[model samples]
Target: MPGTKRFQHVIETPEPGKWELSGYEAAVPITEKSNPLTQDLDKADAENIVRLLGQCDAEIFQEEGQSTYQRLYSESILTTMVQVAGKVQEVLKEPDGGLVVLSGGGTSGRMAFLMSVSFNQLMKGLGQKPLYTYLIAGGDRSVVASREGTEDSALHGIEELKKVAAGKKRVIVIGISVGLSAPFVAGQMDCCMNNTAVFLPVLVGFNPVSMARNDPIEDWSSTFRQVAERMQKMQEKQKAFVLNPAIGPEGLSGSSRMKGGSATKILLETLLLAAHKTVDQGIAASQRCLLEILRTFERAHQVTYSQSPKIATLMKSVSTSLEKKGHVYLVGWQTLGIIAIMDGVECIHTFGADFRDVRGFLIFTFSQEDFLTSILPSLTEIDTVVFIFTLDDNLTEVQTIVEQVKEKTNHIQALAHSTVGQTLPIPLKKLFPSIISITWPLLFFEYEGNFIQKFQRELSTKWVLNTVSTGAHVLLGKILQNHMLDLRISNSKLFWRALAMLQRFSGQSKARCIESLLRAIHFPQPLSDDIRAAPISCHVQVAHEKEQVIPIALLSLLFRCSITEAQAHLAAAPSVCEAVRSALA
Candidate 1:
């Protein structure tokens, strides 16, 4: 009877989708716009929160709606994809003499690092020289931790781009800024346009060029929008390309790491893989091929969401671990492992969770000594352990870890994708307390099963892990509405975001908001004269070493208290959202 009632409830609550009308927050780009769907996200229980996120992600694939934002499937983006992939095809013709650099800032940067490496590995397997390089705002180690202060410096961005492309003849640079906002990428784009003879630039983002970030890069001549304008000019002759379409706002307001990151992966993978088809297999990188690959990913989304009920249940289970003051571990094999650690670190930046809170591990990265002494010792009955693998993974090794994990915790789970007709072994299936297994239809599997299948599975796992981490934290009050109020302010872009959010929730003027935040972020010590006028990047660099910045900033403004008094008040409130409610109240 309860199950029937639950089914009825789900059948009725169909989310048609939420579109934000003009609000005080409308001045920002669509990438930073809030979705009405999850406005009460922090107040939601675990299962409902998962449902809200599913509805939010569904917006990624939605076609033309009442809203003016262009979708991933927009006609212009399709043409741009074709043009960009065609450029990749050209580079592959004589890759040894050419170079393709994929660069980005923050989460956008990590995807560039990942996709560049993944595609290069495929080239290596086919006995071709690797042709892709990844440049992030904070260098390589920035991939694991927040060293994004470099995101502010145009000089650093330009210097890195030149250093990476030195000694190379023809270079194609694909710069990613999910919000079209990173000065690091903007500087790189400016460099490409300046040297069009040797560099062809492709700007990949989720916002239209008109809506690209207008913030001035410190000491730079042009802003991101200005550089995008220049790209639009060059695009007439196919010299440079801009693949930004308004893929609606993220599930969580300005948290571009979710939908923005996923869209970046899908688009770039399709572009790179389309080029691979042409150069490696003598196939056409036609518009039809690009459309087909996109449709395949659309189907992947459907397959994953079709099991939303099961996914929600698993999300709640992980949240239970969080509630018990325990950890959640994701141990994966191969590329899936890379995705695991990536998700692990992303939680720190967005949710402000401890690295030890939810850890992502590569199974092979752990030797027997490390596993026994470090990992196994930490696995308590309260901790949730998840194994991410495919049929292609080594079963004996996976099963051995599963058995080992069972001795320490009863909350072992699995997220598996069955390709073609192959299914998980019965013994493996029987090992987990719960499993989320999605099988690709044999008819769909008839397509090339080499890289596409693996790529799709990694994306599907990525979707699940993102949900679990975000969902668990939301349940734990890390999220307020759709915004993460306690987000780490480690970069200039993020520093502005904190100010924007403080302005929104406090309904204060940008001027007062700015002053209040400076007071709060500067904390117990009074702000010195020199520090007040320093480049915002220096202030951003300073903010990273501080904690609870956004929360304290908003708390002070909300109560009209001194920054010191706000910290004392913040202790009284359990979640940051209480400050929002103080104003909302």
Candidate 2:
């Protein structure tokens, strides 16, 4: 209680936003609630957008209050984290017989991969065995691409975890699902429960146990909520741990890639670091340690937003380029390259942007001369080229490429970070038209060259890029009422969202909405009995073949027009928002 009380002020005070409970907001989970602070995000200037997003992020560290949801700084959460870290310590101490696995779906899985790699590297640096492993729903390639459908398969999750833990005598599996709704993660949790002899289960999510997904998972006897409830019972005996703390809703409705992704990074890093300390220094993981680490992350958040004006400027520049139908290319080396790629892939799913509209390239994947000679020449003034690197990167090589790129385009920018005392080379600094750089103090990291520093940098960069990508799309009218109206319906989660959108915009019955969506997915002909008899998976596969099918269907349903007319209207409109507006009018 004393540890929790120490950071009471850390909890952010409620701000004005449409996300507050009332109307539709009351019905959605915290992760899906629209932030009232960002109600006008689409119309806000770059500076205001940055400020709004900063305020929204502050909710992740907020203290518990009278709100229906528990905040991240609550005592129960920190205590649970301490216990989980202890388990990690136990696993580390007996490395020969132990395996620690992190698993998740979508952004959750991506964060799992990033944290697993960083933790293993930390072990290697300390001369300890690397016993950590990661399991994403669709394997490693899914780390760079959207693998939404795989999240629905519970059996696949079990098999993946089993394969990774085959020879281990003791296994600790931390399954992350921000909404606690992924069947894949639920299955893994169930697997751990069944084999209590060798397995310890940890469910890391953002919702309370009661709020876990209750929808029936296909071919599974229990829902995610039921599995979590079972885990909560097992947790009483120290066989399991459930770390679910409320961080409030995401900035954009249901886009967990922002706060959800950030919290995952923070919580996982805290646990891993605490575990390492427990094993190496014989220090017990405690509430104080968890709280202190969290406070540092809070500072990182502050340091990141302290440069709001600069970040906003870069966002505005990128938004302008995107508005003109030009691309935004993120080029980074090493792990930063993975971050860039992850961000770019998220943009495609969030805003329904074309893959080429935003791309990330890893510099190491190609020869420098080839990349500069072949790729650099193809870029023009309209394209925004972002170099994501730090002082750790080869500055001379970066400078050379920048010079060559300047010959063709002036739309160059940089998201650079470095140690607090280090200064960027003046020549290197001058290469970019604009730079949003962060100088991280040693206090925020465990040590120099510590892998945690890279994680911190990655979170900061993730926030900035998420803002740029989300803001640019919002300004382009891709978002309507804080919802990504043009999202790709490639899986079950998105299919339900599509139905919801159809119902919200068209004022149609649930059955009618489903019928219209089916019509849209199978357009130009009447819905077949066979198609209607098919499951949601079949319909979703068909839906993935088309772009903005939900919007088109909603327009057709509301305006009493054929699918062909809806397509024509959408073609004539400037954006999906305009198309919807025209249909409603």
Candidate 3:
């Protein structure tokens, strides 16, 4: 015990990037671990932000056995991918109950919706019945907005899963928790674990089993680690599966929306699409098939990130809009439209910005509704409209909107895709002030109907938009170091993340940080017994109704000031990072 005590007190301030070291803040999961890269992201320019993010994303495709973490190509991970794909293939071939539900909170939930809609459309294209359903913790509004409090209830998660699984015999529940911390997913996973014959439970996350959240849920008996342990037991018998690969940390600490969301999309796409091919075409879920499928995405990552200079330039343009307090609009066509909508909506969640900071619209209907709604402050020189589409999309519609929106704002950009011989016309290209047109190889993946061509392109666009939105926020100084210090603390998982950031940056004890946060939310009022004893969910509900809880708490802690003074200090500061910097100084 003497050695243990000595080890515990060895490192008072954890060094940046070496988050794996056994010291301060290493207790968090890998997904929540602050990456070694991008520690200075908040201070970086658009180009450096892009380059650093590209490096952070490069970890997603990093080589196997290079570190202790399991990678995308690790043998154990590949085997699990194949096994899960086989189950999906089995269910697709058989119609018993025929239901697949993907659920999560925040970006994970958004990806679930994205995967469900895309896969269902694929089934519909093949004349198969629609079988995919998605559940976001805060409901449909959570898709465009954040409902962090909804993400805390196990009861709510269970109720939604049961309702969706009604009248279905065999249901596949894919629960995504990037850090294995979402109680919503944990509650549903427990429900599925209880009834194995009726439900095949699959957990998709990005941390090792030992690091799964062990926090005690208010109304739940088992922790997430317990649930994962049970799933591992069932996995041995081929009844349940847990697909978790260590993809390093986020560019920003606890900002899983960046890398964690991308990994979830990559894994689910592999599982769903591989099984689809197995059922339709005679392909097997062998390692070769899985490897080839993943290679396509790896190639997609390469192709998209190869244009880092352009992505950086576009990021600079978007940051200008934010600097002027203007909006960034994403007008996309087809599935690319859907991707744009997701990136834009997630901007609201990730940076705690107003929904108007960035918005998404479909190409056809943007003109009628999304393009122009409530013209207050009006579209001006500051607003930047980025057109997202492919050669297969309706260019004429794009041309119409291009000229139409041009009348309101001359600041425009474009992200268009095409095959080798299918570039956008010079007339259309010249219409936008800036454009990044990606040309892909026709048969790079050598698949039928070029389905992969579409997937690759979508993934490509997803990376680009993620780069732009994240880069823009970084440039606007919403970040502290690489952490989203102004994050909406709506759920228990985010509550802990906010506390961790406070403890790390403000150099306060965990106990002290929690008390500061409570003071920040219940400012100027003496703590009520009920408020002190209330669950984490209650604290989050109150926090959600307030603004800048973390920054406010940090200000109070570092300055040793009252809640009112902390609030005033934060209000007077120019940005979140600068406020924290002053306190640290």
Candidate 4:
């Protein structure tokens, strides 16, 4: 019923065909290929956008059915999951000096941090010492902030892993990179291989070993693919494990934060849950048990997309807020709060949105509270507030805040969740004018009481919010043909992405695009020798000060004008899509 007639057509329509790997697609990894299902995403309406994204996400669970890649439910993947779970169990059983370290860069690293924290908390709740440790490329600040440059430093990754595993007798290091492409992750994996006595290396990602990045790392000897190939050889005898299953390209081209991030959560959760259950309950890591957990997650994916109409409505509302120059805020509690903040931060990184354009706040963080108190007073109607909570959260406190905020602005909504058959109080439901609630089945609660239920809810919430933010941004014209053209070039990967986008849009040669980008990045000053000779890290450091550098550069190439003239055109038309459109016309 939630998928009403208005959106039913969009939902029922089959997604576009699987991407054919011929030309460019054949050369790139599956994670980097443009999704055939979303090639026209930039031109879609709200309903169609959500539908395409749902289909894109559903690909994660697809079995090997006429597809060229192994999926999450593939036989090889399941066996790998069971083996990793067994390894985790082995470490947990004798963790006196043992450590379980999860490491990655960017969203992969963020997912590693989330998985580590949740598992450690679960261990503490069981009255055991926490044994899980997490390593992000850029440290704790990078957990919330997007620190893309640090991902280029493989040497730094080795040093961080060494520091964490120094005193450990056995270290199970699961290095995650969505595309199996991060040099930082590769460096850590290489280190683990060298110290096999203490560190048992496991590579967790979403691509096959062959497709792992073959690009050379700066100041490093080997590429990611070489390291992964070596690990695969070690995995033959069970000395190591490579858990890379293909989940198709992301909904947005190369945007790993969507399906890549979700698959990371699901796969790691499965591994950790299987390990914990086997250790705690003496349950063997049977094939059926592993498949059941993966199947349950498959059902969660289905359940999350069932409410397509409601999600599309939220997407429209948020898009309208952005269109009207209003801000959108997500206030969440507990782990849901962390998920919301991650989504918010990714929007900034993905769409080049301002920090204030779409912000997320943890209800308990005092710094966020201070901003809310001061910022709320100045903008009332222009701000849209969305509360993210589950039945497990403090409903009374939620009610108090919702009521307090209702007095200031009527643009309030809620994304709430509860177990099936449990109804919210009538009074509480009326606090927010619009609400999108998902009632999850009770099967998720059977194993770990509230823990499993909460985990499922978090994933469901992630799917929903990811669709909302991505769909809303798509409607606001941030994307171009399924590519995020307005992305901030803050790292080596993004800098390269910027150059590629410039060339693609302007039909210029690579050298010309690079020159145009450099001029725009260091605009108002001619390309000095110092700027030319500087590394990408230097260009990125300077590019952060300039907004829409790629757009400005693209405009210059298309019109063949001076940098100042291109800037003037952008000033006249602030919307990147419109400016580019007008230039092409």
Candidate 5:
């Protein structure tokens, strides 16, 4: 915390990939070049980044070029790459030869995996690398896919970390959580601190201090709450950066990517950038470099958000086309290719449903025929592809694809780099440098659209006052189907629920009805499924009191019938035994 300082570098003339920079070195307060009124706007914009981070949202605000801002918080793929690279560098520089352990559940862990891979690449660039291994809950395949069980297993995580750190001197464990709590992740952090020097950097977005009131607001998870409590006691004597930026509430409740992803990006980036500047002179270069990148974002946001007369016409046309067509296709290649994919995925994930529901699509288009052959076949036509390079670079090949598309379809959009006649089919030299920035604002605009769409969906839905359960309940409900379908009857609560359903449908007395139901259905009364439940073993279950009788009682109560009547009805409908009681009721 002592080393954390806010330094501003002024850009007299900001250019793409390059910029003129000036900074004050003495750590003294200096007057801003612009007035408070002017700085207020920039501060507000920056604070919006904070607000968005806390809420976990992403968007690119744009108008017709020149004044766009590509806004995203930290956990973004781009931000993750930067933050992860920084942490790897930090660990490598330490004399203890640090160990990097990534822990979390769901996308939090998946994103960590992506960040770690990118960080490893960064290590290769620096010619210095630290020993890094992942302690993921469900293992490597879980990186690309979802694995829910691994996240909450505290003991599993502890054992895994111990195995991974068999000989490590210093270990730093990074645990990502929306509320900054994960049992396994926390358990690992707790265990690591016992013998070795451990740095537990929690990724969270909720206000730790907001627990006093009874208002039902979203907060950190239980694991995080525990860790936050521990950190609070520790913070009394030392400093800890709990790196949390509020993005906003998720478009879909508890979907952390909206704000969580962005905040993760912001916190990680701030730490990485701050560290990068401290370790290398690349700060100036990086700042200048990022500013240059920001320009493109600014231009994109301006174009997308512009209310001006000239841009309004284009905006209206684009808006109308998107409305009528359901989605506007976005096309790109290489880096742009990834961004397009991220754009589509992020929007759909945050907004729910599919990208087609929105009035936009991020597509990847290429000029090389070989590349197209290799990549294009994997893509869906539901996407809009944008060509990344000029036609002259590979015009003959480019024309072949264009001609093919023209033959089949008339609808296509291009984010071209060159004008018509010589290179691409259009004159767009002035806009080429601005495309990167355009994406930023465009993303923000998409968020606005997504928010509106979310409101519409919520409007028609009936609101319910369900009691809040634990995180496991929320997780299961979010991913699982109803009790009639995918319900696991492995436990008592579930078994009772099933019997209750049967009883509700059939009027029956508990004892006789349960016996009739089990016998009629050919199910063992004690519910033993092993092959050893032989004829001799079948009658041996006298120890447990009322085991068979309970189910009958539950069923009779459910169906409002005498046990004998329920038994009689059940005996007549062997084909519909399961539903016989219910149907009769």
Candidate 6:
């Protein structure tokens, strides 16, 4: 049996008390002053109430034993959700603008995906074009199931996001993680620095704090405490936790797929609704409705029940593929080709990584096999080779290409129903060089703020330098190394800075350094007239020509020494006005 089947052991032996050590109860304590009508609920009722939560669109309603009144999805809660949505919308709505919605394979990520879709649809319905792209830790499949490599270091998140927002003018990144310490989200925020803000719940499960625990004993209380401290230090903007203990203990025991999932849906949906209203009607809606809806859902938790194990496994497989590749490449049929390719291409260019990393490439061509064969050499083990062969006549071609790649890489990873076989004959290595399959989508979720913006600037600099130039003008194009070896000593400021740099690198004073440089240039007659005539001010125009500039700088160094040696040297010196003419002579 798979570990998932054995997971029954965890669900069978319900341990509400173990939560005490986890600080689950403490982090969500019910105070004496707390209203009895709104505060406490015994365990059974909490469980029953939470299990009753149905779909995301379900209305909130009070139970007989519940002290808190159920709140419906409304304008107020919608406003807060919409505020974030609107910010993202504004970012995406600009010219050459784009937005990234990133998250792990948790409730937060799921909510982010849902919110993005909801916003996209909402815009489409109102005659506005969709304005954003989603980057889930596990991709689309993760929306239905968890997969591998979905959450790692924040740096990887930074790296993946760098690939997505690469050349766009402005990137609005939205990261969602139940645990704020999610390395994925952290990476994005860290890189974005001043450009992005990492928005997450204040509960024990998310961020910077979760760094300490492993799966068995997640220690929510300790993690929450640590996160609180870090947030204080970073002075980052954050959303406060709902902190409702009335519905403690997740249905599957920390499987946040229950409450975490629902909370994410509620929060993100409300945000989208709010933004839609704001953009369309210009009415400032209240967030109370959204807040109450979440609170009510918190009281009435819901569990999704299904028996489609094969479908579940398939979902898991998709998530795994996305995680392994660090991207999702979406390819579609002839009709859907343009939009699908646009999404994939945009993501690749924006993030600055290849299509294989962050996407499940959807190839929508009829000659899938021919194309695969043609581009096989350019493809990498890191690339995802997929074909979206629908009910068209080209399905056979798609299947043939997939089988061929399977023969090459030895992996049977593809998304196809009925007509698509369950597994390929070879292992993962034959079709491609590496395993591009992951168990989950890598959630590189983070907030929009300074960190992301800073990373964008850095990414742009790298991209510009690489494609623009390679020779001497390269350094002039972008001084990424921070030090300019061929820098021109055009003015007094540059001269002093260069001197300081030379002193630091060579560890010699200005006098000895100048002497060594002069000697290297092989000046004739010890300190000749040509060397004395060249000064710092005259070399500005000749900076790009390193050969010409270098010799002139060497002359300046010699002049400083000769002038210092005696008053006669000054008299011998040609006029500074005609220094360029004298130096060439």
Model 6 poorest 10 in a row by lDDT? 464-473
lDDT for every model?
Answer: 0.79, 0.80, 0.80, 0.81, 0.36, 0.37
What is the lDDT, from 0 to 100, of the residue 157 in candidate 5? Answer: 68
- The candidate with the higher TM-score, 3 or 6, is 3
Which ranges in model 4 have alpha carbons more than 4 Å from their true place?
1-22, 367-379, 444-449, 522-534, 560-565, 568-575
Local accuracy of candidate 5 as per-residue lDDT tens digits, 1-585: 110110011112222323113221111111101112222221222222223222222232112133322223223323433444455455656736477766665556654654455444444555656355555666766543323434555577677777876676656676666545445565665554454355534333333322211111112123445555664454334322243333333433344433344344334433443343345543322343333334433332233223123222222323343434434334443333333333444333232224442221222233455544654454333333233332323444445555555333334433432222333333433223232111212222122122211111111010000000011122222221111211222222222233333333333333333333333233234333331222211222321122223334334345565555545554565433244324534
Q: Model 2 RMSD to the real structure? A: 7.1
Summarize candidate 3's per-residue lDDT along 1-585 as a digit string, tens digits: 312321232234445654447444555678887777877888788888888888888788786665487878898988999998888877787766779999998888988987898788788777889999999897877776655567777888898898899989888999999989888899999999889888998998989998898877877889899999999999999899999998998888777887888889888887677788777677777878777778877877877877888788888889899999899888888778878888887777678778778887765235434454544126787788888888888787677777777878887888988888886765546786456878887565433345677777777888899889988888876777877877877677777777777777866565567678888877767677666666677777778777878888988888888888887877788766778777788
Q: Candidate 4 at residue 446, lDDT?
A: 37
RMSD of candidate 1 to the truth, in angstroms, is 8.4
**For model 5, where is the 10-residue window of minimal lDDT?**
460-469
Candidate 5 stretches with Cα past 4 Å from truth are: 1-92, 130-137, 147-150, 159-166, 196-203, 207-222, 237-241, 281-585
In model 1, the runs with Cα more than 4 Å from the true position are 1-24, 65-67, 280-284, 426-428, 443-449, 527-531, 572-584
On the 0 to 100 scale, the lDDT of residue 569 in model 2 is: 82
Query: Over 4 Å off in model 6, which ranges?
Result: 1-86, 92-96, 106-111, 138-146, 196-247, 288-585
> How does candidate 4 fare on TM-score?
0.90
Candidate 1 TM-score to native:
0.91
lDDT of 1 by residue, 1-585 (tens): 312321121112111231124333345688887788888888888678777877787777788666576677877788888888888888888776699999988888888888888788788877789999998987888776655566777777888898989888889999999988888888899999988888999998988777788756677878899999989999999999998867777878888878888889898898788878766567757778887888888888888877777777777778888888899888888878878888888887777777877888886367534776788877897888888888778877787777788899988888877766786776545786457877886534322436788778877888888888888888877677888777778877688778877876776665567767777777666766655666676667678888888878887887887887888777777656665567457
Query: Candidate 2 regions off by >4 Å?
Result: 1-25, 444-448, 528-530, 561-565, 568-575
TM-scores vs. true structure, each candidate: 0.91, 0.92, 0.92, 0.90, 0.45, 0.36
Question: What stretches of model 3 exceed 4 Å from their correct place?
Answer: 1-22, 364-377, 426-428, 444-449, 568-577
Comparison by lDDT, 1 against 3, better one: 3
